[PDB]
UniProtKB/Swiss-Prot annotation, chain B:
Highest taxon in the source lineage: Viruses
Protein name stated in the entry: Uncharacterized protein 114
InterPro entries, per database record: STIV_B116-like, STIV_B116-like_sf
RNA sequence: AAAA
């Protein structure tokens, strides 16, 4: 059983269909405790944010993950649709975080 | 029960937790038949994707980059790219057609809770 | 929110 970290969920993470995905929202403390795991976070500002929140030392690792049944995924998620192609800067993602728009999830396949 | 069309599935589409979704893969024909319907709520948020699906399906969608929020028993059809792209990539029509012809544009049906 |  593997555990992954990502900056979004994508259907491209799934390998077999149909599949059921169970999604729960968790708080910062639970997120940080559980990710302190295979990192796929693919944006620099997100790495900086989670390292600051959790005291971790992840580095950007923009790779494809493929989940199997009973794999688990932690997501740090932006709770707003952004402009096309948006890559958030540190200032931008911190502003979103401080406005309640960066949220944390646990996903079981 | 509402039906939506999108260019991805995102956790930001969900409103209540914990929740389940079930995701299944469908082919182009099934996708086109199910979205060529008057009830569907379009959220496709890139121009090339609109042009691609209109060409594949004979539809007349326009770009509508909005937030959808799914409730229990809602259904979602997704057209998406089957590969992780460079950061911030917005595919052109030529690019997305090439991906489509190489098997890298895939179609999904999602049932929420 | 085509893998924020």
């Amino acid at each position: 059983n593997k555990v992954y970290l990502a900056n979004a969920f994508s259907i491209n993470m799934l390998t077999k269909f149909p599949t059921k995905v169970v999604i729960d929202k968790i708080d910062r403390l639970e997120f940080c405790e559980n990710i302190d795991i295979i990192n796929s976070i693919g944006a620099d500002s997100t790495i900086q944010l989670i390292n600051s929140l959790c005291g971790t030392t992840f580095q950007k690792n923009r790779v494809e993950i493929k989940l199997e049944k009973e794999d688990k995924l932690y997501v740090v998620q932006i709770s707003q649709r952004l402009e096309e192609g948006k890559i958030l800067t540190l200032e931008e993602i911190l502003k979103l975080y401080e406005s309640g728009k960066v949220q944390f999830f646990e996903i079981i396949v």
